[PDB]
Write an enzyme that holds these catalytic residues in place. Sequence first.
Site, PDB file in Angstrom:
ATOM      1  CG  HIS A 132      -0.336   0.204   2.526  1.00 38.85           C
ATOM      2  ND1 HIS A 132      -0.088  -0.779   3.430  1.00 38.85           N
ATOM      3  CD2 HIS A 132       0.094   1.358   3.070  1.00 38.85           C
ATOM      4  CE1 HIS A 132       0.483  -0.279   4.496  1.00 38.85           C
ATOM      5  NE2 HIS A 132       0.600   1.026   4.291  1.00 38.85           N
ATOM      6  CG  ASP A 160       0.367  -0.401  17.461  1.00 40.18           C
ATOM      7  OD1 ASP A 160       0.940  -1.327  16.872  1.00 40.18           O
ATOM      8  OD2 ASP A 160      -0.825  -0.176  17.216  1.00 40.18           O
ATOM      9  CB  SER A 161       3.913   0.237  14.090  1.00 42.09           C
ATOM     10  OG  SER A 161       2.849  -0.624  13.740  1.00 42.09           O
ATOM     11  CB  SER A 217       3.137   1.870   6.225  1.00 38.69           C
ATOM     12  OG  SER A 217       1.894   1.493   6.782  1.00 38.69           O
ATOM     13  CG  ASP A 223       0.392  -4.189   2.589  1.00 38.16           C
ATOM     14  OD1 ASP A 223       0.800  -3.621   1.562  1.00 38.16           O
ATOM     15  OD2 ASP A 223       0.163  -3.508   3.602  1.00 38.16           O
ATOM     16  CD  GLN A 264      -1.994   5.817  10.939  1.00 33.54           C
ATOM     17  OE1 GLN A 264      -1.988   6.106  12.142  1.00 33.54           O
ATOM     18  NE2 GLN A 264      -2.668   4.760  10.489  1.00 33.54           N
ATOM     19  CG  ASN A 281      17.218  15.132  12.067  1.00 29.10           C
ATOM     20  OD1 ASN A 281      16.454  15.522  11.186  1.00 29.10           O
ATOM     21  ND2 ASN A 281      17.331  15.828  13.162  1.00 29.10           N
TER      22      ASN A 281
HETATM   23 CA   LIG Z   1      19.460  12.949   7.634  1.00 30.23          CA
END
Ligand SMILES: [Ca+2]
Lengths: 9, 223
Positions: free
Chosen positions: B40, B171-172, B177, B84, B174, B54
């Site tokens: 997705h 949790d993971s 993914s 997926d 948005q 970063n």
């Molecule tokens: Ca960087």
Amino acid sequence: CTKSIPPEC
Amino acid sequence: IVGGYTCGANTVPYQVSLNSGYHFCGGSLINSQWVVSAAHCYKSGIQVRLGEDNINVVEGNEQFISASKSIVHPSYNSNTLNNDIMLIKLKSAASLNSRVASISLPTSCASAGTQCLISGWGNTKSSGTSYPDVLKCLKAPILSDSSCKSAYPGQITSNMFCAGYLEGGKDSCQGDSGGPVVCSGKLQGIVSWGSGCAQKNKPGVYTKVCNYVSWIKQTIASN
Ligand SMILES: [Ca+2]
């Protein structure tokens, strides 16, 4: 929702 | 990643960021020219950014490489999120070293209770939106099949598993993914979906990579 930016719900 | 910790620069050298003028999905470098992510996350014009910590500052160990091809699994179903998984070929091979390195594919699926590391630049808030600059890590168990199917009745296929905490709070989320769930040095899962993030009794659901190892090998062999 998928965890993509943006989510797909 | 909600309830996680700052990984530390270079500590997850297989983690990639998929970028299109902004970070929108993660992925995993499985060899010098190929990345595994979620179907997705597919879109045209992906730049793969390797060696990142970063994502907003050029600090030193980065490699920005355009995707040459994005192979979405031919049976991906956007409605159920069954199958997926997507492979991305890099236009050019990465420079592998300490700060940038591949992750191994599993030879066997993982048992319930195995502890795994999930990482990503996704949202760190369950109610809200706060995106980190630097990579966030989280340790989480693979949950049993029966708890996963009880949490998501009718929705869990053979190609999925749940990992996380039923108490909620970690949790993971948005932005995460397509990123890695690594267990015992092997890539077992790909961040895929869930009802919200870090909600009680709604653990994250993940693509079960051990069901795809022959597919991945044969496809890579062909392209
Ligand atoms: Ca960087």
